[PDB]
Amino acid sequence: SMNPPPPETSNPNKPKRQTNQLQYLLRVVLKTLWKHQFAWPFQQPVDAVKLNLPDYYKIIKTPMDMGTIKKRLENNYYWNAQECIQDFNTMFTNCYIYNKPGDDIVLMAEALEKLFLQKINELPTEE
Numbered sequence: 001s002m003n004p005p006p007p008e009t010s011n012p013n014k015p016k017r018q019t020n021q022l023q024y025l026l027r028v029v030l031k032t033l034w035k036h037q038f039a040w041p042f043q044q045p046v047d048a049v050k051l052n053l054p055d056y057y058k059i060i061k062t063p064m065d066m067g068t069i070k071k072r073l074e075n076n077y078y079w080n081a082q083e084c085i086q087d088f089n090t091m092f093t094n095c096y097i098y099n100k101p102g103d104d105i106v107l108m109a110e111a112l113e114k115l116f117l118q119k120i121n122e123l124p125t126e127e
């Protein structure tokens, strides 16, 4: 069994910003979801080998996880908040696409997504 390379967290060619909206996505959004009791399945790339999900990367072609998002935020990978919000939505979408409706992992994604939507609802004004 084989995992793909993880998503990019470092690219010196990619233009970067440090903004109050991106600061909010780290200090409020990422940290709120990261500390949650249901965070653990989403804190690193899906290990399709260890989790015995040999079809995972057959079905999921845009993998994303909060480990990757955390690295991207800490290493100022993003230009704008929209890129980071897209990474969260990709992570949730992948979970719903791959998994059987009603499975524990789907309920865990739903709990994290509820808090995500509450925090993004009050994304601060650009300085």
Ligand SMILES: C#CCCC1(CCC(=O)Nc2cccn3c(C)nnc23)NN1
Pocket: 041, 042, 046, 051, 053, 094, 095, 098, 099, 103, 104, 105
């Ligand atoms: C018996 C048995 C297998 C249990 C199972 C397989 C799918 C699975 O494990 N999915 C995931 C496990 C960890 C993290 N995941 C993310 C993120 N998305 N999906 C999963 N849940 N029905």
